[PDB]
Structure 1
Amino acid sequence: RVVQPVIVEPIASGQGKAIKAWTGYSVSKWTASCAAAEAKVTSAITISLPNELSSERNKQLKVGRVLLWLGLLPSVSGTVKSCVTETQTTAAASFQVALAVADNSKDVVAAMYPEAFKGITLEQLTADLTIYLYSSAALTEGDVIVHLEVEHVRPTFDDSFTPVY
């Protein structure tokens, strides 16, 4: 083949292509504020459904892909790592078996799970999975906000009013 000249166009933060939800799915996005932690400790963060997903009908919605990313205070230093895995007996061990890890030392600070949790219900997601957060430096409560974006079947129960009788 003949050499092809290319020009790599720089893009700004936020310009990345957004991953579109599957047909019939929507992406629910919510946050967890980290707890205070000593240096080099890995903390478990429970996954709790937002109120709009906690109803009897909505708890059963099947999960698709899952995205995890971190919101750090601008002054946070050191290494911050986070992942979603099946609940561990030892919190630190989560990073040894996670299929993706959000690590602030990387160019892209985000962990995508396109297959690992597909097909479970939202309730199962809360019961079986845990978020793990590691910091090389001690964390004050709220230093890190964990953003969890969970793709799931679109709820249908709210496509109509409650019958008036």
Structure 2
Amino acid sequence: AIKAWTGYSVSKWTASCAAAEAKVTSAITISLPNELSSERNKQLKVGRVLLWLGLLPSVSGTVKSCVTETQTTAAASFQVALAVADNSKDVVAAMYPEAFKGITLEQLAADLTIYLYSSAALTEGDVIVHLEVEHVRPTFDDSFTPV
């Protein structure tokens, strides 16, 4: 498997798709994990992003998803996507990686967002949208307070 750079680090989380009618593009918002939620960590720099997708077997249609800046109408977002994850492939992935170097981890919570499309309708949680983020290593204080 792929390795992060020296001085970089990995974390992973999850979100579930909202129910939606066919051909509609839905939107999903990135919320940070608790391990990074403090004001010390939000100012770290992103190094790579790796969207991923997995699905329960009764979903029959095409399914596509991507990471972009937030686009003012949801469906249009794919038109600037530097790659698209796609259940028509053998492997349903979209490793960028170069898209977001030097962006603050705050900004990856602020306005980068995840979009999802299916040619058939979805019920809640029919799709699970993993995400993986590789970023500058978090640090904890090396010493107690003074007395």
- Aligned residues of 2:54 and 2:92 also touching (Cα < 8 A): no
Identity, % of aligned positions? 99
- Aligned residues of 2:27 and 2:115 also touching (Cα < 8 A): yes
1:27 match: secondary structure? strand
1:77 positional shift:
1.1
1:47 match: secondary structure? coil
What is the number of residues matched between the two proteins?
Answer: 147
- Aligned residues of 1:34 and 1:142 also touching (Cα < 8 A): yes
1:65 positional shift:
0.5
1:159 match: secondary structure? coil
Q: Distance in 2 between matches of 1:150 and 1:75?
A: 29
* Among 88, 91, 97, the residue aligned to 2:74: 91
2:94 match: secondary structure? strand
Q: Which residue of 1 aligns with 2:96?
A: 113
1:162 positional shift:
7.5
Structure 2 unaligned segments of length 5 or more: list them: none
- Aligned residues of 2:66 and 2:83 also touching (Cα < 8 A): yes
Q: Which residue of 2 aligns with 1:57?
A: 40
- Aligned residues of 1:57 and 1:157 also touching (Cα < 8 A): no
Q: Distance in 2 between matches of 1:135 and 1:162?
A: 54
Q: Distance in 1 between matches of 2:106 and 2:100?
A: 12
1:158 positional shift:
6.3
Larger Rg: 1
- Aligned residues of 1:63 and 1:121 also touching (Cα < 8 A): yes
1:47 positional shift:
0.6
Deviations 1:108-152 (A, max 9, x none): 210112111111111111112000000111010100011110101
1:22 positional shift:
1.1
2:54 matched to 1:75?
Answer: no
| Distance change >3 Å, CA 101–CA 158, structure 1 → 2 | farther
- Aligned residues of 1:68 and 1:83 also touching (Cα < 8 A): yes
| Distance change >3 Å, CA 123–CA 100, structure 1 → 2 | same
CA RMSD across the alignment: 1.6
| Distance change >3 Å, CA 71–CA 23, structure 1 → 2 | same
- Aligned residues of 1:32 and 1:145 also touching (Cα < 8 A): yes
| Distance change >3 Å, CA 159–CA 148, structure 1 → 2 | farther
Deviations 1:93-114 (A, max 9, x none): 1111100111000122101121
Q: Distance in 2 between matches of 1:162 and 1:104?
A: 53
Structure 1 unaligned segments of length 5 or more: list them: 1-17
- Aligned residues of 2:52 and 2:131 also touching (Cα < 8 A): yes
1:51 positional shift:
0.8
